[PDB]
Amino acid sequence: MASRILLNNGAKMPILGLGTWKSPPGQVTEAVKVAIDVGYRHIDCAHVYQNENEVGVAIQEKLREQVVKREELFIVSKLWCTYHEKGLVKGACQKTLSDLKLDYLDLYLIHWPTGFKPGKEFFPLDESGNVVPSDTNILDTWAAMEELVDEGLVKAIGISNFNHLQVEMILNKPGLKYKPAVNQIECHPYLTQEKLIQYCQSKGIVVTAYSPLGSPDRPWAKPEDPSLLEDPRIKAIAAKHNKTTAQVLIRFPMQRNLVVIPKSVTPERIAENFKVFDFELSSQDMTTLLSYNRNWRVCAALSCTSHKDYPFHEEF
Numbered sequence: 001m002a003s004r005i006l007l008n009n010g011a012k013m014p015i016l017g018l019g020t021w022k023s024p025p026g027q028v029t030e031a032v033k034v035a036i037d038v039g040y041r042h043i044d045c046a047h048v049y050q051n052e053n054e055v056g057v058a059i060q061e062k063l064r065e066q067v068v069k070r071e072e073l074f075i076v077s078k079l080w081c082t083y084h085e086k087g088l089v090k091g092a093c094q095k096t097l098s099d100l101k102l103d104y105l106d107l108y109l110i111h112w113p114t115g116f117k118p119g120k121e122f123f124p125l126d127e128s129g130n131v132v133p134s135d136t137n138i139l140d141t142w143a144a145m146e147e148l149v150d151e152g153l154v155k156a157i158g159i160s161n162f163n164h165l166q167v168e169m170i171l172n173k174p175g176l177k178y179k180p181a182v183n184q185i186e187c188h189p190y191l192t193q194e195k196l197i198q199y200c201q202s203k204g205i206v207v208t209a210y211s212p213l214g215s216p217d218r219p220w221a222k223p224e225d226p227s228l229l230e231d232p233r234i235k236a237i238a239a240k241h242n243k244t245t246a247q248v249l250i251r252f253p254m255q256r257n258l259v260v261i262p263k264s265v266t267p268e269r270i271a272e273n274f275k276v277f278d279f280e281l282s283s284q285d286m287t288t289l290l291s292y293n294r295n296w297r298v299c300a301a302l303s304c305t306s307h308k309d310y311p312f313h314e315e316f
């Protein structure tokens with residue numbers, strides 16, 4: 001399969017990237033170095049992950065070593081929820097650029113549609129534990145993202161965790177200058193996202209699947225929770241193809257025309273997870289994997305369920 005997908009800004013995006021949420025700061029520099037050595041050309045980052053400095057050390061060294069050229073890398077980061085106001089967006093982007101030691105991002109996403117009160121805390125709370133919202137709306141935050149393109153800080157802009165009505169709001173924005181290039185959403189066999197994916201694809205927005213392995217290292221995992229990597233039905237498809245379960249879980253979104261960003265800090269898994277471009281799942285395999293949907297969503301915050309822009313009350 002071709003390694004890159006064409007975005008609606010005219011640039012090409014590698015369909016396989018390395019995730020970095022939860023990658024410890026003392027391990028992520030080596031993880032990213034290994035990833036680049038073994039072929040990864042897309043790294044998914046965020047300021048809220050608190051490890052962009054260390055990701056940046058790896059990127060800079062591989063550029064300095066001339067393992068890769070900057071134009072061959074596709075670096076993604078995300079605007080955190082406490083920076084949705086007009087006067088904070090540029091500085092938030094520039095902090096990410098400075099940490100990653102880059103002079104542009106390939107893609108910058110609104111991390112969540114929910115804006116929070118600015119300040120030092122990433123989740124500012126009231127005395128009862130509700131997140132304290134910002135009043136800045138989605139559309140004004142989008143205009144601030146458009147400015148970043150026009151200032152040369154980012155080559156593409158997009159969104160993450162937006163439901164279809166929220167995507168539609170941006171597409172219908174008065175005076176829209178740049179369409180979102182990407183919507184990055186949770187997607188795996190237990191949360192297959194058909195409706196939202198079809199909507200986004202019909203509008204020319206590329207979907208990136210996050211937590212493709214079901215995020216088994218999520219901090220709030222419980223022992224009884226469903227496990228994609230241990231699902232015997234998925235293991236059986238993997239065995240039939242002489243591949244690992246993770247390799248099937250990565251190839252699955254690729255064949256749906258999605259980008260996918262599995263996370264690992266384990267060198268052997270980083271290399272293994274990239275070895276997915278040379279086998280095919282059948283149509284029957286694809287439909288069988290889709291059949292496992294249980295609307296099992298792992299990534300959301302209880303503190304945000306009354307925010308006006310909470311994305312997951314809507315069906316999709």
Ligand SMILES: NC(=O)c1ccc[n+]([C@@H]2O[C@H](COP(=O)([O-])OP(=O)(O)OC[C@H]3O[C@@H](n4cnc5c(N)ncnc54)[C@H](OP(=O)(O)O)[C@@H]3O)[C@@H](O)[C@H]2O)c1
Pocket residue numbers: 018019020021022044045111160161184185209210211212213214215216217229244246247261262263264265266269272273299
């Ligand atoms: N936009 C958003 O709101 C959002 C939300 C969630 C995630 N994301 C992005 O998506 C990325 C991926 O999602 P995620 O980190 O939630 O989880 P994930 O990629 O679904 O799963 C990561 C877990 O799988 C393990 N793993 C990786 N390869 C494996 C293999 N071959 N065999 C067995 N286990 C394997 C990792 O272990 P080791 O690391 O120990 O090897 C880690 O515990 C994130 O890192 C982040 O970049 C974005």
Ligand SMILES: O=C(O)COc1cc(F)ccc1C(=O)NCc1cccc(C(=O)O)c1
Pocket residue numbers: 021046048049050081112114299300301302304305307310311
């Ligand atoms: O968000 C990610 O990429 C991965 O998850 C995290 C990573 C962190 F470093 C710190 C917290 C989270 C987290 O709680 N996310 C969920 C989240 C965040 C913001 C708003 C909402 C909401 O429900 O509106 C939901």
Ligand SMILES: NC(=O)c1ccc(F)cc1OCC(=O)O
Pocket residue numbers: 220297298299300301302303
């Ligand atoms: N998203 C969940 O299902 C979840 C479950 C338990 C938990 F303690 C946390 C959780 O998500 C993170 C959150 O609510 O901040």
